[PDB]
Amino acid sequence: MRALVTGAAGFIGSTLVDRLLADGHSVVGLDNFATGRATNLEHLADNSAHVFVEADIVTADLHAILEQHRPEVVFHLAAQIDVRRSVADPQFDAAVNVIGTVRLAEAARQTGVRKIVHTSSGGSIYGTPPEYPTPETAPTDPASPYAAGKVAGEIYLNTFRHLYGLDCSHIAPANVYGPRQDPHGEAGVVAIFAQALLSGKPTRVFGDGTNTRDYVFVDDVVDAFVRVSADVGGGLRFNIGTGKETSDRQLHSAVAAAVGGPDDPEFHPPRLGDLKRSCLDIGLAERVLGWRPQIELADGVRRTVEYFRH
Amino acid sequence: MRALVTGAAGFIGSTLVDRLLADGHSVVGLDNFATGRATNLEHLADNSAHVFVEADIVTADLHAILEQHRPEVVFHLAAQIDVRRSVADPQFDAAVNVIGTVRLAEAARQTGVRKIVHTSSGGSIYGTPPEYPTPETAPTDPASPYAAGKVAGEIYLNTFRHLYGLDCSHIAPANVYGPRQDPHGEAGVVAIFAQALLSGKPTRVFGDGTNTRDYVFVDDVVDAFVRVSADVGGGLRFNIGTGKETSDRQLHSAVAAAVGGPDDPEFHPPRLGDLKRSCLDIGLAERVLGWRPQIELADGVRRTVEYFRHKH
C-alpha cells in the first residue's frame, strides 16, 4: 500500500514507519519536529521506500501533499501529546489535535484517501470510568484538554465518514513505552525513568505514587495500527493495551531493577489533569482484528533500558 | 447579576440580552458581526445596564474582556451557524465553534465566572437516532462539521468543569424561529419563507419536502437560557424544542397561510450535511428546570410574519 504517517518523526510514528517499510509498503513521513526528532528517522537516509515531508498539520497545504503522494491510508499520529501542556495551553492543544485532524480529513476526502487511522487516547478519554478494565462501550468523560481533543478528533472523523465515505478507525492505546520514546520529554515515564537511572540522575513519582497505568509495548501498538488499516472497524474505536495495572512506584522499582542501582524516587505534588487509574479492556481488538499484546512489562522494560544503555 | 452574552448582536443573543435586562441584570454583549446586525441592539444605545464589546472569540483577548467585566454567567451563543457553510469550510467552523469555545472557557476559569451556559445544537448532534422524540441520553452521531463542533464544545466545557469546577450547562435547541432572524440568511427557513412570500419571490423546499424539524419560538428558547443560568443542571445538556415534527412542505403551507397568497414551492435537490428528521424530547427540561414551550407553531408563525410586515 501507499501509506502516509503524520507524526512520523515521533516515538510511535517512527516505529510504525519501520514496520510499514518492513512489510513492503511505500511510506511518506510527515512531521514538524514539535516533539519529534530527526534522529528517530536518520537510519532511513538511504531507504528507498521512504520520503519525508516537513510540514505543520495545522497550517501546511495538506491538500497538495496528499494530491502529490496519493496515500491509500493515512496513519494520523501527529498531536500535542502532553496532558500537562494541554492544561497550561488548551488552545494550542485544540489547534493541533482538533484543527489539525479536521484539516487532514478535509484534505483526505478530496484526494481519494481510503481510510484514516486516527490515534485517540485509551488512557485518558474515559476519564474516571464506571469500571476497570474499561471497554470501548464505556462513555467518554475527558478530564484534561488533551483528552477532550482526542474525543473531538474521533467525532470529526466519524463525521467525514458520514459525509464523504472517508473511512476511519480510532486506535486508542493505553500507556505506550519502548525504544525511541523521548527521555527528555515530560511525558513518557518509562523513558524518563530509564535515562535518569542509567545516568544516576534524580527521579520522581507524583502524589503518593499509587497512580496506575496500563503499560503496552510499542511494537504491539504498531501491529494494531497495521491490522486496522484494512477494511475493518469503520467508525469504531479499538482499545490497545494489556488489561494490567502498574503503579508509578511499581514501575520505578521495575526500571531500577533492570538498570541496577537505587530505587528511591522523590515524591512531588500531584499534577492537575492526571487521572489516578487506567486499565483497558482489549476484547474487541482480539475478536475483530486478532490483535493481542505479546510483550509483558518485565520484558519491555529490559528492551527499553538496553536501548537507552547505548 | 452580571451577565455576558457572546453572539449578542445575533437573532437569539439580542433576544436574550433583552430578557436579561428586563430581569434587572447588567449585561455585556459581545459580537464580531460575522452574521449579526447592529439593528438587533440599536434600541439599547441609552441603556446604562448594557455595554457592547466588538470582539472575535477566535483572536480577541477574552481574558482581558472578562477580567474587566467580571460576569457571573457567560451565555455562549457566538458561533458559525450554517450547516452548509460548515461542510464547505470545516476548518473555519471548527475554529469558531471549538477553538472559540475553548478560548472562552480558558478565560472564564481565570476570571471568577461561576457558569458558562453553552449553546449546542439539539437539532443536529443526534444524527439519525433510533428514538424520536430524541432524549439527551441518546448517543450523539453528528453528520456535519457544524454538529461535530457543537458536540466538541460540550465536551470541552465538561472538561473545564472537571478541571476547575467552572460550571456549565448546554442548551441544545431544535429549530428556532421568530423576530430578528436574518431574512437574508443562508439558514432559518421560517425567515427565508416569510421574506420571499411577503415580496412575491420564489421559494423552494429540498428533496421531496418530507424532511422534518422541531420548530420552537425564540422567546421559549430564551426562557430556558435564563432558567439554566442558576446553580442547576450542572454538566447536563437540555433539549429545548416542542417535541412536534413539521415537514418542510407543511411549514411552507403554514407560512403561506399566514402571509396570504400562493402555496407553490419549487423542489430542489437535497443538501449535503442536512439531516432528514429532527424532533426533541423535552422532558428533562420540564422535570429539572420547570421549562415548557408556550408558543405553538401557528401562533409563532403569525407573530413572526407580523414582525416582517412592520419591517416593510
Ligand SMILES: NC(=O)c1ccc[n+]([C@@H]2O[C@H](COP(=O)([O-])OP(=O)(O)OC[C@H]3O[C@@H](n4cnc5c(N)ncnc54)[C@H](O)[C@@H]3O)[C@@H](O)[C@H]2O)c1
Ligand atoms: N505514548 C502514549 O502512551 C500514547 C498512547 C495513546 C495516545 N498516544 C498518541 O500517539 C501519538 C504518537 O505520540 P508519541 O507517543 O509517539 O509521542 P511523540 O511526541 O514522540 O510523537 C508525536 C509526533 O507528532 C509530531 N507533531 C506534533 N504536532 C505536530 C504538528 N502540528 N504537525 C506535524 N507534526 C506534529 C511531533 O513532532 C512528534 O513527532 C500521538 O497522537 C499521541 O497523542 C500516545
Ligand SMILES: NC(=O)c1ccc[n+]([C@@H]2O[C@H](COP(=O)([O-])OP(=O)(O)OC[C@H]3O[C@@H](n4cnc5c(N)ncnc54)[C@H](O)[C@@H]3O)[C@@H](O)[C@H]2O)c1
Ligand atoms: N437558530 C437556530 O435554529 C439554532 C438552534 C440551535 C442552535 N443554535 C445556536 O444558537 C446560537 C445563536 O444562533 P442564531 O440563530 O442567533 O444565529 P445568528 O447568526 O443570528 O447569531 C450568532 C451570532 O454569533 C456571532 N458570531 C459568530 N462568529 C463569531 C465570532 N467568531 N466572534 C464573535 N461573535 C461571533 C454572529 O455575528 C451572530 O451575531 C448559535 O450558537 C447557534 O449555533 C441556533
Ligand SMILES: CC(=O)N[C@H]1[C@@H](OP(=O)(O)OP(=O)(O)OC[C@H]2O[C@@H](n3ccc(=O)[nH]c3=O)[C@H](O)[C@@H]2O)O[C@H](CO)[C@H](O)[C@@H]1O
Ligand atoms: C492515563 C492517561 O491519561 N494516559 C495517557 C497519557 O499518559 P500520561 O499522561 O499518564 O503519561 P506520563 O508518562 O506523563 O505519566 C504516566 C504515569 O507515570 C507517572 N510519572 C510520570 C513521570 C515521572 O517522572 N514520574 C511518574 O511517576 C505519572 O504520575 C503517571 O501516573 O498521555 C499519553 C500521551 O502522552 C497517552 O495519551 C496516554 O493514553
Ligand SMILES: CC(=O)N[C@H]1[C@@H](OP(=O)(O)OP(=O)(O)OC[C@H]2O[C@@H](n3ccc(=O)[nH]c3=O)[C@H](O)[C@@H]2O)O[C@H](CO)[C@H](O)[C@@H]1O
Ligand atoms: C436538524 C438540524 O440540524 N437542526 C439545526 C440546523 O438547522 P437547519 O440546518 O435544518 O436549518 P434550516 O433553516 O437551514 O433548514 C430547516 C429545514 O427547512 C428546509 N428548508 C430550508 C431552506 C429553504 O429555503 N427551504 C426549506 O425547505 C430544510 O430542508 C430543512 O429541513 O442548524 C440550526 C442553526 O443554523 C440549528 O442548530 C438547528 O438545531
